Write a protein that binds this ligand. Structure first.
Ligand SMILES: [Mg+2]
Ligand SMILES: [Mg+2]
Ligand SMILES: [Mg+2]
Ligand SMILES: [Mg+2]
Ligand SMILES: [Mg+2]
Ligand SMILES: [Mg+2]
Ligand SMILES: [Mg+2]
Ligand SMILES: [Mg+2]
Ligand SMILES: [Mg+2]
Ligand SMILES: [Mg+2]
Ligand SMILES: [Mg+2]
Ligand SMILES: [Mg+2]
Ligand SMILES: [Mg+2]
Ligand SMILES: [Mg+2]
Ligand SMILES: [Mg+2]
Ligand SMILES: [Mg+2]
Ligand SMILES: [Mg+2]
Ligand SMILES: [Mg+2]
Ligand SMILES: [Mg+2]
Lengths: 155, 123, 82
RNA sequence: UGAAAUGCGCAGAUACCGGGAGGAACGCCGAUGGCGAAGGCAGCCACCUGGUCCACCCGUGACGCUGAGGCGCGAAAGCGUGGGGAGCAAACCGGAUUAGAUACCCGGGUAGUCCACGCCCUAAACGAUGCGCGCUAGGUCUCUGGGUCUCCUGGGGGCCGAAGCUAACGCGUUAAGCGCGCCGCCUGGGGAGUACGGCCGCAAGGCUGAAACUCAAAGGAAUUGACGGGGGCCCGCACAAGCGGUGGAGCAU
């Protein structure tokens, strides 16, 4: 993509909640394009959260993501001589990207032998500042709370 | 006395920056020094001593260790041409040290002494 | 600069006041005046500034130097701020 | 320092303050500037001295231009005697990079760079364009004297350009134009600026300077293009972001 800066395609809201992020997440669980399967999984996992948790399923989801979303990265560059880390703010379009992606990963990383369970819980673990999911947002925003030498750029 | 916690309240803050390392210094209003840190003083060993952090970070230790003798306000004194200028400074402007004045005194020979090959042209 | 070039100087013309009024240029004592023909530092300003012609500066300079030796004017003074 | 290491630091370095010794160069002014026969020449001050431009038309009265040979001057380096030696730095000592580095990089270091007198005399000593003189549109910027002074007249430096010139690039009243005087010099490349002779030098070397042989070329400017670890602009899932996979296994081809 040289110029024109591709335009962010907007998905269609959810059917059980009608709120973007839901599908978006749904999408990340999906494999080989199977919606339904991946769909049940989220909705299943949404159910398991009204029980093991009293909090409504949506709030657990949405409030589990914002705890994930990274606010800083490290886009390497060549200040010449070596390959610097160079950290920057995360465009809000990206945060989401990584966020959900992250969850779905860490999820499958866990032990439980299921789909929802893996999902619901790590969501829940996320709505308390815990979980392998959130773990990564930390190992990340850390390689960026300092950066590393761009003084030749004086300004 | 023992090691004596001497109060100074005010002094100097000489800063030496160059394409190699950044040395900040603290002194008494009469030149005499109190404590100096650097890039070397804190980990950083190679070209990491000319890393702009080499400014602030040192330019924080100069402070911290320099606030221990009172000093609340200092008169900065920049020197050399390179990177780290102002940073070492701003570093003191957040360190807790009020900054009286900022001065430049970089020494440029009115042409004397043949520089090392490494230096000769410009334009 | 950037789209300004900042080099647009319409031959001055009627130069404000021509920087002062009626003051010799071979005054190896008249500091009071000379002190103005020097940047923040005893750095003699260029032609660009001041407001002098050929033979003139050759003198102004030849003078400021004669002054420094008398300890009247400075060679190099410290810089404040920045 | 690209990263490093040698190197210097607890006999306390670096970094900051004060004081002292020494050598060398001399900021900003400074320039697209100036002066000089060239080499070359910039802190300031005084002194001794060269050249030069202008205004006045006052004096001499062709007394002029060139210039083989001669003589003198001639960057840097180098050489001799003696002093000085801060920084720098051939050679050389180590450090590192490399397939290997007696190199590029790094840390030291001698001659040297400095001054005196004497010697060397070469140079991309280049404007690569001998000196003088007369003639042939302008414009523009700039240094310096005269001027009825932002205009005209003289000297010097640049720019652009008439005619003209030139193989072209370009030059063009700072001619590579038009002319005259005189001087030097060229007469294919390589062998050679070498060999020999001679002159010169303390030496290193320098000036003068061939041929046998050999090759059909060596060469100059410009055109098209290609190429560059040249530059500006710009596209392609080319990179990045991202999803799945290949490289592992069994099999198939
Ligand atoms: Mg590299
Ligand atoms: Mg210290
Ligand atoms: Mg004279
Ligand atoms: Mg003659
Ligand atoms: Mg010499
Ligand atoms: Mg000698
Ligand atoms: Mg020594
Ligand atoms: Mg020729
Ligand atoms: Mg007149
Ligand atoms: Mg002229
Ligand atoms: Mg022309
Ligand atoms: Mg023509
Ligand atoms: Mg020769
Ligand atoms: Mg002979
Ligand atoms: Mg040739
Ligand atoms: Mg050619
Ligand atoms: Mg495509
Ligand atoms: Mg990719
Ligand atoms: Mg295979």
């Amino acid at each position: 993509a040289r110029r024109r800066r591709a335009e962010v395609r907007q998905l269609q809201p959810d059917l059980v909640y009608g709120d973007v992020l839901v599908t978006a997440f749904i999408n990340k669980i999906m494999r080989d394009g199977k919606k339904n399967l991946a769909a049940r999984i989220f909705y299943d996992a949404c159910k398991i959260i009204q029980e093991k948790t009293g909090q409504e399923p949506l709030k657990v989801f949405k409030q589990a993501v914002e705890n994930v979303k990274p606010r800083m990265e490290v886009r390497s560059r060549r200040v010449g001589g070596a390959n610097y880390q160079v950290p920057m703010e995360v465009s809000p379009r990206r945060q989401q990207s990584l966020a959900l992606r992250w969850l779905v990963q860490a999820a499958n990383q866990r032990p439980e032998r299921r789909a929802a369970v893996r999902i619901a819980h790590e969501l829940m673990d996320a709505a308390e500042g815990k979980g392998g999911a959130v773990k990564k947002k930390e190992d990340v925003e850390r390689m960026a709370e300092a950066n590393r030498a761009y003084a030749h750029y004086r300004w | 006395k023992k090691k004596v916690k001497r109060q100074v309240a005010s002094g100097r803050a000489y800063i030496h920056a160059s394409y190699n390392n950044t040395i900040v210094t603290i002194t008494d209003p009469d030149g005499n020094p109190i404590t100096w840190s650097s890039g070397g003083v804190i980990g950083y060993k190679g070209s990491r001593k000319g890393t702009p952090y080499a400014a602030q970070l040192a330019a924080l230790d100069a402070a911290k260790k320099a606030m221990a003798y009172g000093m609340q306000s200092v008169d900065v004194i920049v020197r050399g041409t390179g990177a780290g200028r102002e940073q070492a400074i701003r570093a003191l402007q957040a360190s807790g040290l009020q900054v009286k004045s900022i001065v430049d005194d970089t020494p440029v020979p009115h042409n004397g002494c043949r520089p090392k090959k490494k230096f000769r042209k410009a334009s | 600069k950037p789209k300004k070039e900042a080099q647009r100087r319409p031959s001055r013309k009627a130069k404000v006041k021509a920087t002062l009024g009626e003051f010799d240029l071979r005054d190896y004592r008249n500091v009071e005046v000379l002190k103005r023909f020097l940047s923040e530092t005893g750095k003699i300003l260029p032609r660009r500034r001041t407001g002098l012609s050929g033979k003139e500066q050759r003198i102004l300079a030849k003078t400021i130097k004669r002054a420094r030796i008398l300890g009247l004017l400075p060679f190099t003074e410290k810089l404040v701020r920045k």
